[PDB]
């Protein structure tokens, strides 16, 4: 009904509660409840939920980090319909980089 699922909003809840929202279950977690990765019925088998807390090895490489270091990704913006391409990337050093194109772009916020 009312949660935080945005770039600055999630960045705040991150540096605030130092932990993704209680409604941020990774994708495998949604599969546990019965979710098809088709990305066309996520909220259908697990409505009121978000995908976050997944490791970000940098499939591309655009975050302030190096080999040996690991980043963290979280779902940004999500309501109903097919998943979206907006997601944030927080690092162990609290480095938050938002991406509005699927890890295709990164902006340093918090």
From Swiss-Prot:
E.C. designation(s): 3.1.27.-
Record keywords: Endonuclease, Genetically modified food, Hydrolase, Nuclease, Secreted, Signal
Keyword Hydrolase: yes
Coiled-coil region(s): none
Active site: 73 (proton acceptor), 102 (proton donor)
Cellular localisation: Secreted
Summary of the protein's practical applications: Introduced by genetic manipulation and expressed in male sterile maize and rape by Plant Genetic Systems and in radicchio rosso by Bejo Zaden. Barnase expressed in transgenic plants will specifically destroy the tissue(s) where it is expressed. After cell transformation, protein expression and plant regeneration, the active nuclease destroys the pollen producing organs thus rendering the plant sterile.
Keyword Nuclease found: yes
GO MF assignments: RNA binding; RNA endonuclease activity
Family the UniProt entry places it in: Belongs to the ribonuclease N1/T1 family.
Function: Hydrolyzes phosphodiester bonds in RNA, poly- and oligoribonucleotides resulting in 3'-nucleoside monophosphates via 2',3'-cyclophosphate intermediates.
Protein name: Ribonuclease
Native organism: Bacillus amyloliquefaciens (Bacillus velezensis)
Region of the whole protein represented: 48 to 157 of 157
């Amino acid at each position: 009904a009312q949660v935080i699922n945005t770039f600055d909003g999630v960045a705040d809840y991150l540096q605030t509660y130092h932990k993704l929202p209680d409604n941020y279950i990774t994708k495998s977690e949604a599969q546990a409840l019965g979710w098809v990765a088709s990305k066309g019925n996520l909220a259908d088998v697990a409505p009121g939920k978000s995908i976050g807390g997944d490791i970000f090895s940098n499939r591309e490489g655009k975050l302030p980090g190096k080999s040996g270091r690991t980043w963290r990704e979280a779902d940004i913006n999500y309501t109903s319909g097919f998943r979206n391409s907006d997601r944030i990337l927080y690092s162990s050093d609290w480095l938050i980089y938002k991406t509005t194109d699927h890890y295709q772009t990164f902006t340093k916020i918090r």
